[PDB]
Amino acid sequence: MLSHMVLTRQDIGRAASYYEDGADGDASEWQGKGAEELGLSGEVDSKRFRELLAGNIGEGHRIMRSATRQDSKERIGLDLTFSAPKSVSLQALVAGDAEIIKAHDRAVARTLEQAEARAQARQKIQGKTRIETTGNLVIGKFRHETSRERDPQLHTHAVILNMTKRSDGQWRALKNDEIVKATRYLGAVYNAELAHELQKLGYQLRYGKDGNFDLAHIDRQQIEGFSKRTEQIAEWYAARGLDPNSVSLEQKQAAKVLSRAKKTSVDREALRAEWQATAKELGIDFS
DNA sequence: GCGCACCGAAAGGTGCGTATTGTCT
Numbered sequence: 345m346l347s348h349m350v351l352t353r354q355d356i357g358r359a360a361s362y363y364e365d366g367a368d369g370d371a372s373e374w375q376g377k378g379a380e381e382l383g384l385s386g387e388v389d390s391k392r393f394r395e396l397l398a399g400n401i402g403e404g405h406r407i408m409r410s411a412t413r414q415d416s417k418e419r420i421g422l423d424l425t426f427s428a429p430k431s432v433s434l435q436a437l438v439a440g441d442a443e444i445i446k447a448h449d450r451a452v453a454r455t456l457e458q459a460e461a462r463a464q465a466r467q468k469i470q471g472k473t474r475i476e477t478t479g480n481l482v483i484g485k486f487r488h489e490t491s492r493e494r495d496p497q498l499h500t501h502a503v504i505l506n507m508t509k510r511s512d513g514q515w516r517a518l519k520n521d522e523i524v525k526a527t528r529y530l531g532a533v534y535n536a537e538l539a540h541e542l543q544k545l546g547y548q549l550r551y552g553k554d555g556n557f558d559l560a561h562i563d564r565q566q567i568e569g570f571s572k573r574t575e576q577i578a579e580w581y582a583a584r585g586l587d588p589n590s591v592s593l594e595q596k597q598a599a600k601v602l603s604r605a606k607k608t609s610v611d612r613e614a615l616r617a618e619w620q621a622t623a624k625e626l627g628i629d630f631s
Numbered sequence: 632g633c634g635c636a637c638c639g640a641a642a643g644g645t646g647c648g649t650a651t652t653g654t655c656t
Contacts (some may be wrong), residue, residue: 345653350646362656411644413637419646430654468643473634492656499656517645521632524649531652554652573655593651600655 345427346455346531348524351503352417359397359420362486362501363390367612368437369449371487375456375502377480378463378509388484396482396505397421401515408507409517421506422520424459424527426452426534427499430567431558432542437489437496438570438619439630445498447541449487452500455533456483459502462522465510475519478508492604493572496619531555562628569626570619576603 351359364372364387372388379385382401384392395401397420399408412418428436428448436444460481467474482505491497508518523530535555542549548560558567568575580599581588591599623630 345651345655347651347653347655349651350649352646358656409638409645411638411646413645413647415637416646425656427654427656433654466644468641470642473644488656490656491654495654497654497656499654501656521649524651527651552653556653558654567654571654574653577653577655596651596655604656 345425346527346534347425347427348527349423349425350419350520350524351421351423351506352419354417356394356397356420359423359503360390360394362484362488362503363388363393364486365488367489368616369442369445373485375453375481375483375485376460378482378505378507381480381509382482384482388486393484393503396484396507399507401507405515408515419506419517422504422518422523424456424502424504424523424530425499426455426502427497428538429556429558430496430571431562432538433496433498434562434566434570434623434628435547435559435630436498438616438623438628440616443545444542445487447538447545448498448500450541451534451537452485452502454537455530456481456485456502458533459504459523459526459530462526463508464519464522465508465516466519467510467512467514467516476511477522478510480509481505481518482507490615491573492607493576494607494610494615495570495572561631566623566626566628569622573603576605579603 374384463478484503486501549557550560580603
């Protein structure tokens with residue numbers, strides 16, 4: 345799954361706390377030609393990440409985005425969240441398979457290359473505006489392992505910073521139209537790449553709809569047992585008498601956000617053991 | 632969104648809205 349969120353100034357605390365969560369390679373990581381250009385590679389330094397969120401690109405540069413209207417919100421970035429199918433999360437995190445985690449990381453990286461290809465900006469010459477395709481991004485990727493309900497949930501926040509290097513060498517805000525309008529497509533890339541990676545490791549796949557898949561030897565009941573957030577969303581539709589098969593975007597987001605109950609930081613080593621006990625109870629055979 | 636209107640004060644740049652399947656930070 346690929347979901348997206350335009351990030352504003354009021355999200356500065358949420359975005360920096362995407363780093364990096366000591367849990368269970370490297371949990372946080374830079375990607376992009378923009379990033380490479382700025383000398384940014386390997387692990388995301390969280391202090392440098394905050395500066396970049398604020399438009400402070402540094403190294404002898406003006407603060408970006410001073411042309412933002414007072415009546416509008418400052419955009420700090422674009423968050424692309426890649427979430428693996430539940431069976432994949434289960435093999436990766438309950439059974440413990442570093443190869444599956446790697447396969448997820450690669451699917452994300454390759455999808456983000458296609459997102460990057462679609463990076464754009466504007467330039468104005470004499471009141472006439474032109475859209476350029478820049479092809480470069482600065483991205484911080486932060487891998488995470490659990491859902492709101494403490495379920496195994498392999499996902500990566502790819503925070504695309506709101507900056508790109510234009511044709512003239514100038515750094516400017518990202519015109520996000522091609523990435524944002526291509527989310528459905530980019531999600532198919534993630535799925536296709538992940539599936540290819542898992543098949544390369546000898547897993548058999550079972551197919552859903554709209555391109556979704558799961559590992560063949562984990563079934564619906566077993567997946568459902570580890571999908572508490574899904575159950576909460578289903579109950580919400582039932583309570584509102586809504587039909588799960590035909591809901592608006594606005595009603596989807598309502599069910600999603602308002603069905604959230606607040607949970608509390610838990611012993612992470614004790615959590616795996618519970619996952620394993622649960623998988624045993626659900627009869628899951630991890631090969 | 633092709634421009635608009637207001638940011639800072641470059642006859643330049645920005646958010647705006649976009650858009651979002653299931654596993655559902």
